[PDB]
Amino acid sequence: TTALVCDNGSGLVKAGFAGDDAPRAVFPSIVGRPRHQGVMVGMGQKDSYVGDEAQSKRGILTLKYPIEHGIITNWDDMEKIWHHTFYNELRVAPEEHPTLLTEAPLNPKANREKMTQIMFETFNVPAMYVAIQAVLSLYASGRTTGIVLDSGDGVTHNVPIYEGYALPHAIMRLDLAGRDLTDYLMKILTERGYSFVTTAEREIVRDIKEKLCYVALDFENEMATAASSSSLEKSYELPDGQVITIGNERFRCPETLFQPSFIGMESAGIHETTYNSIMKCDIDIRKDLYANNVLSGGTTMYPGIADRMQKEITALAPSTMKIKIIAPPERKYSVWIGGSILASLSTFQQMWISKQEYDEAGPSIVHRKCF
Amino acid sequence: YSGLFCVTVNPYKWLPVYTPEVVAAYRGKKRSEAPPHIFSISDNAYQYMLTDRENQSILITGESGAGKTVNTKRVIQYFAVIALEDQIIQANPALEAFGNAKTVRNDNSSRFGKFIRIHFGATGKLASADIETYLLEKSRVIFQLKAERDYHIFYQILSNKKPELLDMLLITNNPYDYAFISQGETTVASIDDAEELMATDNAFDVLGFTSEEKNSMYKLTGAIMHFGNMKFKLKQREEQAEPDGTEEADKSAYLMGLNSADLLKGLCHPRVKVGNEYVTKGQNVQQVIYATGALAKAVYERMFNWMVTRINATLETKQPRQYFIGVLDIAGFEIFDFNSFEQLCINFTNEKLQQFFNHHMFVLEQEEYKKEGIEWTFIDFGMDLQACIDLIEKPMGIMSILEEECMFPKATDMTFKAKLFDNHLGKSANFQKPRNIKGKPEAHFSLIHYAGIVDYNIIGWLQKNKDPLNETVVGLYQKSSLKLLSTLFANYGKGKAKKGSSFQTVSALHRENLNKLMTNLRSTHPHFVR
Amino acid sequence: SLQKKLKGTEDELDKYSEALKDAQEKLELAEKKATDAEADVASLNRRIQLVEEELD
Amino acid sequence: SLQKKLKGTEDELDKYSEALKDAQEKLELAEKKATDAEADVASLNRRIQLVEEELD
Numbered sequence A: 001t002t003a004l005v006c007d008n009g010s011g012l013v014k015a016g017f018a019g020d021d022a023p024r025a026v027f028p029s030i031v032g033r034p035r036h037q038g039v040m041v042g043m044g045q046k047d048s049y050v051g052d053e054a055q056s057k058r059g060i061l062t063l064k065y066p067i068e069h070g071i072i073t074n075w076d077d078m079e080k081i082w083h084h085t086f087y088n089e090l091r092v093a094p095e096e097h098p099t100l101l102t103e104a105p106l107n108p109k110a111n112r113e114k115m116t117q118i119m120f121e122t123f124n125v126p127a128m129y130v131a132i133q134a135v136l137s138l139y140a141s142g143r144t145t146g147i148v149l150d151s152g153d154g155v156t157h158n159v160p161i162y163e164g165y166a167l168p169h170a171i172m173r174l175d176l177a178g179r180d181l182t183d184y185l186m187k188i189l190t191e192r193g194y195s196f197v198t199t200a201e202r203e204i205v206r207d208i209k210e211k212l213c214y215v216a217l218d219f220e221n222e223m224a225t226a227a228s229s230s231s232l233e234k235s236y237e238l239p240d241g242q243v244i245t246i247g248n249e250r251f252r253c254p255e256t257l258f259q260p261s262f263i264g265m266e267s268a269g270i271h272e273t274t275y276n277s278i279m280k281c282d283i284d285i286r287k288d289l290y291a292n293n294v295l296s297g298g299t300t301m302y303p304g305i306a307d308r309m310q311k312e313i314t315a316l317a318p319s320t321m322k323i324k325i326i327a328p329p330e331r332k333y334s335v336w337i338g339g340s341i342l343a344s345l346s347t348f349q350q351m352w353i354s355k356q357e358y359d360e361a362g363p364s365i366v367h368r369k370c371f
Numbered sequence B: 001y002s003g004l005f006c007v008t009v010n011p012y013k014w015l016p017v018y019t020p021e022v023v024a025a026y027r028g029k030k031r032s033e034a035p036p037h038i039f040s041i042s043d044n045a046y047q048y049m050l051t052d053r054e055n056q057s058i059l060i061t062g063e064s065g066a067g068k069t070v071n072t073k074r075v076i077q078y079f080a081v082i083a084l085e086d087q088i089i090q091a092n093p094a095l096e097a098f099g100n101a102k103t104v105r106n107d108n109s110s111r112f113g114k115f116i117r118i119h120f121g122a123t124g125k126l127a128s129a130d131i132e133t134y135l136l137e138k139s140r141v142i143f144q145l146k147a148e149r150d151y152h153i154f155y156q157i158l159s160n161k162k163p164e165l166l167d168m169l170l171i172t173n174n175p176y177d178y179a180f181i182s183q184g185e186t187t188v189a190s191i192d193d194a195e196e197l198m199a200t201d202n203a204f205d206v207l208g209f210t211s212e213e214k215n216s217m218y219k220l221t222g223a224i225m226h227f228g229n230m231k232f233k234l235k236q237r238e239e240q241a242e243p244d245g246t247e248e249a250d251k252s253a254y255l256m257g258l259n260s261a262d263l264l265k266g267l268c269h270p271r272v273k274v275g276n277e278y279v280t281k282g283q284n285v286q287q288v289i290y291a292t293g294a295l296a297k298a299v300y301e302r303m304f305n306w307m308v309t310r311i312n313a314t315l316e317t318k319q320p321r322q323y324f325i326g327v328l329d330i331a332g333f334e335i336f337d338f339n340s341f342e343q344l345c346i347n348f349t350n351e352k353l354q355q356f357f358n359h360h361m362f363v364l365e366q367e368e369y370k371k372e373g374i375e376w377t378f379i380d381f382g383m384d385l386q387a388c389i390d391l392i393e394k395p396m397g398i399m400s401i402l403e404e405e406c407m408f409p410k411a412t413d414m415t416f417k418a419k420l421f422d423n424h425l426g427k428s429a430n431f432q433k434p435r436n437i438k439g440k441p442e443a444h445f446s447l448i449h450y451a452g453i454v455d456y457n458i459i460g461w462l463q464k465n466k467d468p469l470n471e472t473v474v475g476l477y478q479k480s481s482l483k484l485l486s487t488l489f490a491n492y493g494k495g496k497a498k499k500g501s502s503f504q505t506v507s508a509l510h511r512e513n514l515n516k517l518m519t520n521l522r523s524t525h526p527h528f529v530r
Numbered sequence C, D: 001s002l003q004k005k006l007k008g009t010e011d012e013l014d015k016y017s018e019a020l021k022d023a024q025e026k027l028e029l030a031e032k033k034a035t036d037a038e039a040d041v042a043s044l045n046r047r048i049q050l051v052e053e054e055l056d
């Protein structure tokens, strides 16, 4: 028997089988519902579209995200997402497959409890297990120590791990991520004349961000270069023609990660929270943590993020240290790759949560030793 | 006779016992009364086939060079007599080349599990012969011990008696030059390797396949040889592998029928499929080296299996083929003082075989008892040995722990040993401490088998068990300009057991092959020759 | 009688459409490649200045 | 009749030929920028190692 690794994330569902090299199904975690009336009788159209299909009918639908910041807000359409994942993308019956799911650190407990209640009662899986995303990222990166920065689409967190022991008092979590960057880009394009307001235009803006944004190595010098030259402008083609050109906005958007005061937050940049999570750790392991700074998740994919972050952490740390930023090319799938590795271990097959275990101990069994 | 066995010590001089008169005159005498000889069990297998309408299996068990070849030869002679042996012996030097290598106990040891199926018709008359290869060890193509060599073929090619092969393959005469081979015994007084090269070339030219095809075979082996000298370095301020030496890359590509830059890119930057897109995977030096080794082992084993298919096609006769009687040639329960991973695999295979025979003899004794009307002692004779099998194949067994360890991030041999001990020591029955006697080299743990207590060594198992096949380079091979595209024709939702390219282990492939070999044997009534 | 004129115009039109499609394909290809190469050179150049101040 | 559509197809065919011309000009400039960037990055990727050994 084989296990399923579902990295539901927040903004992309990645699913597959444990033991594969990459996720088999990758689609947005979106539920769309039609907002117009519908005139053609016999169309027989359905009430809610899920996943990658809802992006084709994006112009007719109003798109919801069932996961806001790691946390699941809408539970019915989350069951819809899972049903679509199991039956339409993977085509497997979950009554004979153990399921491994991921979650961010420092989340509500009811999230896990309802997740397992659903996975055991609605889908009847024989076993299940909820894992932390940063640990799986380290598994896939091949380290056993190192401080991992896992910037997804809802949540950013640091989890320092040494020799296989995680130091929970030094775990940082930040609610600035890819969706906040999309909203800042929507708000910042307005000053150039373009307006994107619909939930269907938020997807176009996300595409613009992915394909054109980048992190500046020196923010003030890049601002001066844009204010003087024009060698920064690039053009993008909207779905209906209507080419748009952006300059400053290319690097002003992901700079919010290093200056969260752009979107009105009080916290410090990802470089400074990484440094602070290191300084919370014991003095003996800071060498290895500095030397093993692992990036993962989609929001770490901007060109220049690693060089910028190395420059910052180097200017923060003492001069004797070797700062290294580990940023693989298959970065944004590291959580899933590590999850597959983990569920594929023979040593792991006694750490699942069984059906009868749950039936006898209630959903509270998720927080206990069967973690 | 020794019960259900047939034991045969080889005589070193000619005897009249192999004259056709005893062959013809045995017809009509029974097994229970006639004195022991392999003609007896041959006829008994034949008549068993004819009465039960089933296949039979002859399991000749001995060391290469102790008479196994000629024993099987006289078997096939007797079978022809009671009604294509020349073709078998004629194509044999090919297998002798491509599947034999020098070990310490023997200089012409067989590594693959040769097995000849002799079919028949409805009238029990000679119809055709089939052949299958099993359990061919791939680790030899890359790693060789301190006291042993690689396969014979590389040395036979290294015989300068064919200078056209060397000057067309860029093979310098010096055997120390090539790293895949130089770690083993360079040259030994085994045989006249030049003459053996000639005998194999003769067998090739008299076999169905053309001269271009032998040329491609030789050049492919030379390409496998050229894989070993590749050199990779880490990048400037990153963890990525990049090639510094490009000359052997260029020449290996020019041989293989690919582009050099393209093959280097396919090794340094694999591309994997994530849903509907492709993203590039990163590699370091260790990963790219493991991939190169797995690619070489794969292409060699592929060419070998296809050569066996060609041999069988040459042998193939259109006569209808009914029930067969197979004869099996397998490695032995080898013991040494520095047993290793390969010897563990061999002993695991022989464990499955011995347990199979033991259960067979159990059912035979139950048959004797149910005939005699005296039925007692209803315990089987197999589980007492299966208990040792459960320490290799079963989850949390040695093979599963090894797979998990070569999957884990920073695993080392000491950690492997610690996990073996923590998970088996005392809690098991057969796993136990090593023993240090007469100042033996080293031993990390000891298993007990049917053939005695064996002490195994850990060092190197993690590194040698990895088999990460590189899918982009496999696609390159599929797009070659050679015969290579046939060997690599195609190799690597709704319920998919597709294990990844990285989650591949020699031990797992070996367990699968052993499973299917057992499934082929367990359908035939067996017979055993010692 | 002008139908031959019409057909010939259709043929040259089809040829020109195929030509335009191929030219767009090559254009987008080379443009992706130039942008990626410029990204790489700018990144590594900044890295060169950093290792230069490091040497200093 | 057929004349309006004929000459309209003619005008858009000429304009698409203009698109071909400009697209090919963009192809030439793209080739130039790619090759020049390649030479520069060659210089840089061969001297970065010297810089790193200097600091070593």
Ligand SMILES: Nc1ncnc2c1ncn2[C@@H]1O[C@H](COP(=O)(O)OP(=O)(O)O)[C@@H](O)[C@H]1O
Pocket (backbone or CB within 6 Å): A007, A008, A009, A010, A011, A012, A013, A151, A152, A153, A154, A178, A179, A182, A206, A209, A210, A211, A297, A298, A299, A300, A301, A302, A332
């Ligand atoms: N090339 C890219 N550059 C910048 N941001 C990207 C890129 N690709 C994806 N993203 C961002 O990453 C987010 C998705 O990250 P992901 O790893 O899927 O997290 P999750 O799985 O929790 O959704 C998206 O919001 C998207 O904006």
